[PDB]
Design a protein around this ligand. Structure first.
Ligand code: NAI
Ligand code: NA
Length: 398
C-alpha cells in the first residue's frame, strides 16, 4: 500500500507512519544538538503522544536530563479501514528510541479523565516507576466523561455575546474561506469549562499528592494560550478562553496545596501559537499562524513545538537564571509572539490580506508543511514511493 496525503471531511485520512517516526527523530535530533539542561528524572505527561506533550517528553528524555517518562494518551491503532493515528505511532517510535538509549518509557493508552486510569498510573508509580518530580498536563479533548455518573461533557469552540464570521485558511484547497462561529449558551460554556478547564488536572494532582507519588519539591505544569486581539472572539474571550481561565485558576489552587504539603509548585505556561492537530482545527487559527510564521521567521524568532519546549525547560524552568512569572503567576512562552514589533507587523499584514494575495503576504507554505509533517508527510529522508506493510505496522505496540 502506498499512502498518499488525502482529505476526508477536511481531515487527513491516513497518516504516514514511517513519516511519524522521522518526525519524532527530527525532534530528538534537535534536543541532542541543544546545549542541554538538567533537572527532572522521573516525568509523567498526560497528553504525551503529539504536539506540546510529545515535545515535552522528547525534551526531558533527550535534551539532557535523561529522564524516565510515563506517557498517557488517547490514540487508536490500525483497523481494517484505518491506519492508526499520528499519536498512536509517535508513542511507539518514541518508546523505540527511548529504549535504545536505555530509558524507561511507559505508555498508557487510556482516557485520562477516568478514575480507573488514575488508579492504573498511581499503581505503576508506586510499584515500579518511583516518585514523580515533574507532571505535565497537556491534554486537548473534544469531550469529557464522568465515569461515576455516566455524564458526558462536550467541548465546543464558540463565541460569547455575538456570532463571528472571519477569514481562515483551508489547507485542503489552498484557499482563504469564511468561517462562521455562533454564540454559546450558558450550558455550552459550562461543558467546555468541564472539559478544558482545570478540574481533571487538579484531580490528577490531588490523587498523585495524596497517594505519595510526588517527589519533594515536585513541579506541575499545564499549557495555555492568550494570543492577540485578532483571535479574542473565537479563543480567549470565547468558550475555550473561559476554560483556560479556569485552568489558570486551578493552577493557583494546586500550587497552594503542593507548596504546603511537599514544598512543590504548580503553574500554567502560556505557549505560542503553532500548528498541531488540535490548533489546526480552531476556526481562523490557520490564518493567524500563517501570518505570525511569516513575521517571526523574518525576525529570526520563529519556534515550533520542540524549540518552544527546549527553551522553556533550559532557559526558564531548569536554568541558572531564576524563573520569572507574569503578574498573574503564569510562565510566558508567548513572550516573543506577543512582542510589540511582532504584533504590529501581524496586524499590518492582516489588514492587507485578501483571498488573492494571502500566499504572498503570509507563510502559508511553512504552515502547510508543518501541518503535513506532523502527519508524517513532506519530510526529508522518507521514501514516499515505498509500499507499507500493514501487517507489520499493526503488530507494533505502545
Ligand atoms: N497548539 C497551540 O497553538 C497551542 C496549544 N496549547 C495547549 O497545549 C495543550 C496540548 O495541545 P496540542 O499539543 O496543541 O494538541 P495535540 O492534539 O497535538 O495533543 C493532544 C494530546 O491530548 C491527548 N488526549 C486528548 N484526549 C485525551 C484523553 N481523553 N485522555 C488522554 N489523552 C487525551 C491526545 O492523545 C494528545 O496526546 C492543550 O492544552 C492546548 O490548549 C497552548 C498554546 C498553543
Ligand atoms: Na500535547
Amino acid at each position: 500500500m502506498i499512502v498518499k496525503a488525502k482529505f476526508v471531511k477536511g481531515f487527513i485520512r491516513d497518516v504516514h507512519p514511517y513519516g511519524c517516526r522521522r518526525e519524532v527523530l527530527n525532534q530528538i535530533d534537535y534536543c541532542k544538538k541543544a546545549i542541554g539542561f538538567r533537572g527532572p528524572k522521573k516525568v509523567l505527561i498526560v497528553g504525551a503522544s503529539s504536539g506540546f506533550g510529545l515535545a515535552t517528553r522528547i525534551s526531558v528524555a533527550f535534551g539532557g536530563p535523561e529522564a524516565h517518562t510515563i506517557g498517557v494518551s488517547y490514540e487508536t491503532g490500525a483497523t481494517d479501514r484505518r491506519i492508526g493515528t499520528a499519536g498512536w505511532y509517535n508513542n511507539i517510535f518514541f518508546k523505540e528510541f527511548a529504549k535504545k538509549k536505555g530509558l524507561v518509557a511507559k505508555n498508557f493508552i487510556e482516557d485520562a479523565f477516568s478514575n480507573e486510569t488514575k488508579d492504573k498510573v498511581i499503581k505503576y508509580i508506586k510499584d515500579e516507576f518511583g516518585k514523580i518530580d515533574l507532571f505535565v498536563y497537556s491534554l486537548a479533548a473534544p469531550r469529557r466523561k464522568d465515569y461515576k455518573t455516566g455524564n458526558v461533557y462536550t467541548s465546543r469552540i464558540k463565541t460569547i455575546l455575538g456570532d463571528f464570521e472571519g477569514p481562515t485558511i483551508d489547507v485542503e484547497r489552498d484557499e482563504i474561506t469564511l468561517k462562521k462561529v455562533s454564540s454559546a449558551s450558558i450550558e455550552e460554556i459550562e461543558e467546555t469549562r468541564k472539559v478544558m478547564g482545570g478540574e481533571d488536572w487538579q484531580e490528577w494532582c490531588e490523587e498523585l499528592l495524596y497517594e505519595d507519588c510526588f517527589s519533594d519539591k515536585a513541579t506541575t505544569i499545564a499549557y495555555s494560550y492568550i494570543g492577540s486581539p485578532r483571535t479574542y472572539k473565537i479563543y480567549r474571550e470565547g468558550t475555550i478562553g473561559i476554560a483556560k481561565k479556569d485552568l489558570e485558576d486551578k493552577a493557583k489552587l494546586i500550587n497552594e496545596k503542593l507548596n504546603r504539603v511537599i514544598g512543590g509548585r504548580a503553574f500554567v505556561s502560556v505557549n505560542k501559537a503553532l500548528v498541531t492537530k488540535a490548533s489546526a482545527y480552531i476556526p481562523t487559527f490557520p490564518l493567524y499562524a500563517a501570518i505570525l510564521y511569516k513575521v517571526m521567521k523574518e525576525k529570526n524568532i520563529h519556534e515550533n513545538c520542540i524549540m518552544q519546549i527546549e527553551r522553556m525547560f533550559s532557559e526558564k524552568i531548569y536554568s541558572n537564571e531564576k524563573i520569572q512569572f507574569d503578574d498573574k503567576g503564569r510562565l510566558r512562552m508567548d513572550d516573543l509572539e506577543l512582542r510589540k514589533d511582532v504584533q504590529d507587523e501581524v496586524d499590518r499584514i492582516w489588514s492587507n490580506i485578501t483571498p488573492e494575495n494571502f500566499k504572498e503576504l503570509s507563510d502559508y507554505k511553512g504552515y502547510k508543511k508543518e501541518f503535513m509533517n506532523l502527519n508524517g508527510f513532506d519530510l526529508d529522508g522518507v521514501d514516499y514511493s515505498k509500499d507499507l506493510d500493514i501487517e507489520l505496522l499493526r503488530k507494533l505496540e505502545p
